[PDB]
Amino acid sequence: SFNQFVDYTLQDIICEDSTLILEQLAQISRKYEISFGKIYVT
């Protein structure tokens, strides 16, 4: 139940909301996103 965890759940938790975006309006508008990658463990 730990080998299961470290391998898969950790990543699937990342992949759910890698992304979140911020859009700045101008006077043409901006839009800032940031997204995550696959997870690396030492």
Partner 1 sequence: FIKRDRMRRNFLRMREYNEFPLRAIPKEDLENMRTHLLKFQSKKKINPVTDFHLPVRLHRKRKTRQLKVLDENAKKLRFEEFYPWVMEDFYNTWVGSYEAGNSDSYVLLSVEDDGSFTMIPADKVYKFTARNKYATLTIDEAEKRMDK
Residues in contact with partner 1 by CB under 8 A are: 19-27, 29-32
* Shortest distance (Å) from residue 37 CB to partner 1: 16
**Residue corresponding to tokens 């995550």:** 36
* Shortest distance (Å) from residue 7 CB to partner 1: 26
The Cα-based distances of 8 to 4, 18, 24, 37, 41 in angstroms read 6, 15, 36, 14, 12
* Shortest distance (Å) from residue 40 CB to partner 1: 24
SS3 2: helix
22 versus 41: smaller Cβ distance to partner 1: 22
